[PDB]
Design a protein around this ligand. Structure first.
Ligand SMILES: CCN(CC)c1cc(C)nc2ncnn12
Length: 119
């Protein structure tokens, strides 16, 4: 019932994601000169370095907020892809499956800890 445990669990998951070759296109903000129209399509850019820095700054209050930002990385990739068969979009689908598989227990444990605190 540790209410704070999610933070280190998210740091460890981000470390695994950074080790994944599939995270390469998502480690830093999208290159705006390589894709000059990016901001015409994407309203809120997001990347894993921004997520890690927000976490390390103490600017996430819960793992749900971190999860919303990570999911935004994947929805931005889906929105920008010209095809569902593209290389970068295909990498995002595998990385999303990996992330969802590992974040599920982090969210469940945090929500359970909060419920115990208010029992
Ligand atoms: C600029 C956005 N990026 C990288 C996240 C791209 C680029 C290309 C070429 N294909 C893509 N398919 C999905 N996202 N995507």
């Amino acid at each position: 019932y540790d209410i704070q445990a999610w933070k280190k669990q998210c740091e460890e998951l981000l470390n695994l994601i950074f080790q994944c070759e599939d995270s390469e296109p998502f480690r830093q903000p999208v290159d705006l000169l390589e894709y000059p129209d990016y901001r015409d399509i994407i309203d809120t850019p997001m990347d894993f370095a921004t997520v890690r820095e927000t976490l390390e700054a103490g600017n996430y209050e819960s793992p749900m907020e971190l999860c919303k930002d990570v999911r935004l990385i994947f929805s931005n990739s889906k929105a920008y892809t010209p095809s569902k068969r593209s290389r970068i979009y295909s990498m995002s689908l595998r990385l999303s499956a990996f992330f969802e598989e590992h974040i599920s227990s982090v969210l469940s444990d945090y929500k359970s800890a909060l419920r115990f605190h208010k029992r």
